[PDB]
Enzyme design. Structure first.
Site: not given
Ligand code: PMR
Ligand code: SF4
Ligand code: PMR
Ligand code: SF4
Lengths: 419, 414, 419, 415
Positions: C36, C274, C409-410
């Site tokens: 044990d 986000d 998201g994306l």
């Molecule tokens: C170029 C700038 C940039 C940045 C820093 C982010 C970050 C980001 N973009 Mg994105 N995004 C950018 C641009 C774009 N996003 C795009 C798309 C997109 C979507 C659909 C989504 C998204 C998201 C994000 C996210 C969250 C991370 C994720 O994708 O889950 C970041 C950091 C995400 C979200 O949570 O939006 C609120 C989400 O659903 N991006 C698009 C479409 C062409 C562009 C141009």
């Molecule tokens: S059989 Fe059960 S009680 Fe006996 S040494 Fe193993 S775990 Fe412990």
């Protein structure tokens, strides 16, 4: 011309933005077209900020080219001062704007603003995100810092910490903790947190902590020329480097090295029997200079991995990385081409990869376990939870992070195997 | 009570938080399958696409940037010769591609790089296997979705000729939405009907003096010009968003093609009944709520119309990056007369008007969205409205849901 | 008889072991078979300690039964005491010893030691680990704690923190941390870190913070009877909880609630756009009482998930669990059969699972996102880094942990979605 | 000087840190593919197995514990009725299973449920399709690997009768290692040969007065008994760990079946010198280092023999839970005659002896491993040795590797 899918770094101005956004009471005005404001989303999305970046664009378009570009900069420069009454401002050129006649200086002088306006040279077709930042900070420091009488308390500056920087927030917190534990205080932390006025003050700190070479090296150098301020040449990432760091800070200040190690769990963790199976693991490390050099020490010296490849994407860190790689008998791999990284991993088939967002996607594709050590990175690597790289709590975070994606002692020896 | 046709629209330039046409690639490359989008631009443009695509970047997608170097910047006769080298190299390592799009950026346009003529010589050089087109997606020319406009308008001049009386549904739409449209149109007895862009280069639609065409997306001004110039005629219709949009959309095609009264009601009633009931689930948190939209996609006017008439929202200011007068007429006339309209944008000013209004829900850009949340305004990021399926009947519940979600969330975190 | 493969809980005596290992200068002696002792590995390997747990076994076997079973118990105690010279001792029964005639109480008392030897009543065939722990703590406290003058300064105890408790280490740290900011110093933390001479001085606290009902409930209750100390009825897991807890403490004491909210990030992370796609996500919550109740408030009211199932494996929390489940329109799933947990999940068709190491595996089998919230737990969930579940940092860690295993998201809208 | 055949072995008892027989199920069930191990014990028994199996638990493993409730301890409570309703409920959903082991535990031993007689009843009710056995893996009876012994022995009497002169290699050996062995003996011209336990129920070996069997694992006391009880004769060998050990092991069999010395050398030299070369890889880190092993598995003596003669280590104290004089005879006669031998253990006293020796390397259990590391002693956890391929030529390199690793980790961590 160079065919490009992935890009490890952005344009230089984005790096300017990092410095600007890191700061308070600073307005950066950027000369560029509609759309280059996409870079705003980097800050409000990834770093996830509660306000608009202090970045504004002249916003030229087709129907307003020629001599209107000239006018447009003027107007964005005005409006920014008018609206945000900032302590100082910086003006710079976008990659598009660099093909125009317009003089950043000559215009900003002809406005004669009641605050300093710092012009910034940003070679867009030769330099990248990091230089952008490193220089933008330099210009700012060179423009605002003056020689000063020292503080009666032993104090230092924290240099290189920016917005959109990998684990900058918590590193800055943990390094602070280290110094407080030695009876040293932060005079000013710049850029991150600092204002143009905070910057005017820099000269009174006794020394500097160069937290991140790629974004502070220039300003550290300037503050050595200008105000007799030595700077730290060792970045405190990993138990060993922290010891070396504090030993270095000792010689700079003549102060006893006092540390609190009551929460440093990494040594024992890796020393423990659970970890014997980590000895030998072939690891491939890639990222920027700083985080790669640092990781390679922790891997070999602290965890017992064997390093089978080291690289970084920033050329400005090439000789330091080649020096370090030599110590492990490797050719450093200086590249910004993910396919060369992909090819080099393939070649020296590691059992673990430590890299950037890209590397972890290459690792997925290959089916190799991987953890992230460096910028560029997705939104989950700007965590809500406390998560430094630096110092003792960083060394713990680093251990947990790296060991995670593996396969532990037993199964090896698994759910498939047993399946 | 209802009608905005004679509304004065504030035209307004200034500081602008918008996306360049480049971004259109991020979804266009998905629909267009044997196509490839090479932007000729700077590192900045590569960076945008890389951030925009998100995880798509790792999925070895069909786009890239030929990023300019110091050497390329000066001297225009060598800039062209070097490009062809880039293309040949690219084209020789991806034989699966039949369509190459040279997409123009700001830096390519300022360097006055004649990409229309580069496309020209490259088609002749790489026929019959590969046809290469050119279009602008630069900041100086385009806002977000206008990238799709110029893309398609580029394909138009070179499409096949036909005396056929075909229907063309213009605008790339998700493959789910697309089939619904096709099936409803076959059900009403109208055919043959092709999408533009088609999923593959070999199955593209053809134009002639007898082609009718109809827009599925409002941001398709230049493409219309292109089509009308080849002698096709547009069917004017409100945009297929919600029970009402889609019906009125389909009604115009019915009436243009001579589908009977009963034949319409028969095919339409069941799918409608359904959509109206999915929309009900949301009316709850939506009705009475005030609405404001920043300019982004040009989808603002039709969606606003929809939110007000079906989800009973009250509209305040609806802003659009560009308002094509004639294309928007059917929708405009259905907007609640109180609506204030803006074309273009001045960011600082529009933000001031925004605050003053203090609206319950704000549609807006992602660089604008979080700062607004922190200031206590509930917000719905616009960019979703392009990636999510939204057009036609099935998705109309989901469409409303897109706007109910953020409000139900703020209620829920209290 | 019950076919058992997986068991959420060890035998009661392992609980006892959890309470003895938690403490210092206390020896636990189990009357049990040779073998044990396997339960030592739980401590040396999962918790990864640097010392053999203060537990020893009489170690009877085939060749020494009958009149000899009693003899072996005696020497076990004799040796234990003579060697480690503990402040106080415990004696208890293994399941196998529970079928013998032997008297722990009488044998301890005939042996007549220079220190207290507290016997423990642990029915092995009805009750489980958690009872074991709670009771062993109760027994000890009942025998050592004596009423005293209150601390001049406002102090309290922390009750329920044991060895091998899921995140007990960092919880203790974090709760001390927020009670410090409120001007309340911690008197005795027990069992964790405390000797029996510390237990002897529980009586001088103003109140008790009942950190874990599962392993403190009974000793909080005795200290209310005996030392007139009220104990807190709210467990500070999550923002809402912490806030209520702090206000509970305030009422118990008269001091104003003083919060340091400077690193509290979860509310805003959760607020941001986000996070919007998290709304309505169907979550299934399972583990022990305390964490399940706590998690479901975070899930519903702080993250915006929709709780679609709630349950626990410990009958001793059934009343509190049922109270809560009904607040979500749900009926609590009380069971310890992993197979019946799996049917509930299959039936509830959830989008995320918050559970136990068992649920991590059901989740994977089922292809579902999953995070761990409660013991029992693998070694990874005893981490190097600061990893509390309680207080403000907890709320950060929790947020981070939970959103991890989900698509973003994306993608959701759009890897083989593209491949 | 070699030869520990005279050395006085310390007989010792008291506090004991070892596993019970029950834990044999964790590796045993992997090898017997259509067997099931139902341990009739307490929640402790199930908890142990859960902890032992670790991640295997999540993979519907072919073992379980029938755990004693309160009502089962009553003096009216029905043993035969209760257990049977539980095995039929098991076999209903597991039609795949052909061998059922009713493993005895401490609890089921103190109440003394006649599990052996329960095996009979149930065999009756469930033949032909499925057959059931009974052995003990209790803490009262067994230590760790003795659970393989009791198990295999419980099958021996059941085994088919034959008059053939076939070789039985005895030991649950990892499949890769088993094939290797099977090949080397085919190459040597001895055969056919068969393993106990066989990979499946219907290819178990038969037993008779001409059967010769050889031990691949050192803890097969009872199985030797039951096999000798059927008229089979053992072959005396040191165990096939290391190049030397494996050669001797093969040579024993070769001699037994009368294999021409040349044929032995032809088969052997090739992968012999290969294995030896793959040991020199770990020599520098091992040679001269002092070794101490705690009792776990009875694998101590032969591994201790392999570490001294091939890896160049010095023995100190080598302790074993059970020292079977006649079986260890071949290995003991190759041990450094300086070695202190212990059968059994009194934990506290043996720890005191450990500190005083302060050895370079220590082989021990996991409850002892980490506490010793913080004391400053480099440790090698034994449990590995049953779960890793370790016998025969091919894995000889890997075997030394297992002990050089913790020593290499120590060096490369604090340089
Ligand atoms: C170029 C700038 C940039 C940045 C820093 C982010 C970050 C980001 N973009 Mg994105 N995004 C950018 C641009 C774009 N996003 C795009 C798309 C997109 C979507 C659909 C989504 C998204 C998201 C994000 C996210 C969250 C991370 C994720 O994708 O889950 C970041 C950091 C995400 C979200 O949570 O939006 C609120 C989400 O659903 N991006 C698009 C479409 C062409 C562009 C141009
Ligand atoms: S059989 Fe059960 S009680 Fe006996 S040494 Fe193993 S775990 Fe412990
Ligand atoms: C009896 C309890 C127990 C516990 C808590 C662990 C944990 C543990 N066992 Mg395990 N182990 C236990 C026992 C056993 N283990 C066994 C096996 C085993 C192996 C082969 C291995 C292992 C390991 C572990 C480990 C390390 C974590 C892991 O591998 O997941 C724990 C915590 C792991 C290791 O790294 O050992 C240092 C490894 O390779 N265990 C066996 C053989 C039947 C037993 C009896
Ligand atoms: S095309 Fe213009 S707006 Fe778009 S990324 Fe390039 S420079 Fe910026």
């Amino acid at each position: 011309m160079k065919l490009t899918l992935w890009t490890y770094e952005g344009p230089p101005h984005v790096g300017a933005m990092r410095v600007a956004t890191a700061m308070k009471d600073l307005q950066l005005v950027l000369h560029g077209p509609q759309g280059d404001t996409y870079a705003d989303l980097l800050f409000t999305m990834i770093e996830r900020r509660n306000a608009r970046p202090p970045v504004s664009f002249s916003t030229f378009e087709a129907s307003h080219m020629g001599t209107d570009t000239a006018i447009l900069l003027k107007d964005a420069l005005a409006a920014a001062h008018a609206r945000y009454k900032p302590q100082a401002m910086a003006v710079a050129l976008t990659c598009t704007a660099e093909l125009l006649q317009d003089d950043p200086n000559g215009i900003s002088r002809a406005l004669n603003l009641p605050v300093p306006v710092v012009p910034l040279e940003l070679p867009s077709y030769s330099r990248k995100e990091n230089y952008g930042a490193d220089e933008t900070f330099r210009a700012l420091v060179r423009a605002l810092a003056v020689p000063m009488e020292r503080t009666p308390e032993v104090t230092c500056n924290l240099l290189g910490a920016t917005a959109l920087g990998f684990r900058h927030r918590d590193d800055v917190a943990e390094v602070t903790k280290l110094l407080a534990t030695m009876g040293i205080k932060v005079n000013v932390c710049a850029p991150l947190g600092a204002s143009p006025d905070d910057l005017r003050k820099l000269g009174q700190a006794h020394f500097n902590v160069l937290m991140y070479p790629e974004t502070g090296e220039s300003a550290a150098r300037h503050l050595e020329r200008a105000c007799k301020q030595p700077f730290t040449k060792i970045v405190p990432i990993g138990v060993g480097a922290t010891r070396d760091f504090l030993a270095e800070v000792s010689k700079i200040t003549g102060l006893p090295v006092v540390t609190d190690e009551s929460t440093l769990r990494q040594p024992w963790w890796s020393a423990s029997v659970d970890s014997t199976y980590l000895t030998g693991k072939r690891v491939f490390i890639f990222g920027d200079g700083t985080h790669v050099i640092a990781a390679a020490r922790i891997a070999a010296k602290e965890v017992g991995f064997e390093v089978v490849g080291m690289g970084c994407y920033n050329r400005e860190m090439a000789r330091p990385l080649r020096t370090a790689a030599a110590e492990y008998g490797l050719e450093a791999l200086i590249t910004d081409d993910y396919l060369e990284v992909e090819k080099a991993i393939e070649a020296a088939a590691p059992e673990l990869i430590l890299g950037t967002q890209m590397e972890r996607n290459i690792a997925k594709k290959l089916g190799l376990p991987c953890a992230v050590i460096s910028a560029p990175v997705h939104v989950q690597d700007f965590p809500a939870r406390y998560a430094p790289q630096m110092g003792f709590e960083g060394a713990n975070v680093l251990f947990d992070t790296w060991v995670h994606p593996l396969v532990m002692g037993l199964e090896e020896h698994l759910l498939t195997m047993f399946r | 009570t209802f009608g905005c046709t004679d509304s004065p629209v504030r035209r307004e330039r200034g500081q602008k938080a918008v996306f360049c046409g480049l971004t259109s690639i991020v979804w266009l490359h998905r629909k267009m399958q044997d196509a490839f989008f090479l932007v000729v631009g700077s590192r900045t443009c590569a960076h945008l696409l890389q951030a925009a695509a998100g995880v798509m970047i790792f999925a070895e997608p069909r786009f890239g940037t030929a990023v300019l170097e110091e050497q390329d910047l000066a001297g225009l006769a060598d800039a062209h010769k070097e490009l062809d080298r880039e293309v040949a190299k690219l084209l020789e390592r991806r034989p699966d591609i039949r369509q190459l799009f040279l997409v123009g950026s700001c830096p390519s346009e300022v360097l006055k790089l004649d990409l229309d003529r580069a496309a020209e010589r490259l088609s002749g050089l790489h026929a019959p296997h590969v046809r290469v087109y050119s279009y602008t997606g630069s900041g100086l020319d385009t806002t977000f979705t206008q990238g799709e406009d110029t893309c398609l308008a580029a394909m138009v001049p070179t499409l096949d000729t036909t005396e056929a009386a075909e229907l063309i549904v213009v605008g790339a739409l998700p493959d789910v939405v697309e089939d619904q449209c096709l099936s409803l149109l076959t059900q009403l007895g109208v055919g043959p009907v092709r999408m533009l862009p088609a999923r593959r280069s070999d199955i593209e639609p053809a134009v002639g003096p007898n082609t009718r065409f109809i827009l599925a997306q409002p941001f398709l001004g230049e493409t219309t010009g292109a089509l009308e110039r080849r002698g096709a005629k547009r069917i004017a219709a409100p945009f297929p968003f919600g029970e009402e949009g889609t019906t009125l959309w389909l009604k115009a095609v019915a009436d243009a093609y001579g589908v009977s009264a009963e034949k319409f009601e028969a095919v339409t009633a069941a799918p409608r009944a359904r959509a109206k009931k999915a929309i009900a689930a949301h009316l709850e948190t939506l009705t009475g709520k005030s609405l404001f939209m920043f300019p982004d996609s040009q989808l603002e006017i039709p969606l606003a119309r929809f939110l007000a008439r079906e989800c009973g929202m009250k509209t305040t200011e609806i802003a659009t990056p560009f308002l094509h007068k004639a294309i928007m007429a059917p929708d405009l006339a259905l907007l609640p007369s109180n609506t204030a309209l803006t074309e273009g944008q001045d960011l600082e000013a529009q933000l001031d008007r925004h605050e003053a209004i203090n609206p319950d829900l704000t549609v807006c850009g992602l660089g604008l969205a979080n700062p607004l949340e922190a200031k206590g305004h509930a917000t719905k990021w616009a960019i979703e409205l392009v990636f999510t399926p939204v057009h036609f009947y099935e998705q109309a519940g989901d469409l409303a849901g897109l706007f109910s979600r953020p409000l139900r969330r703020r209620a829920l975190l209290n």
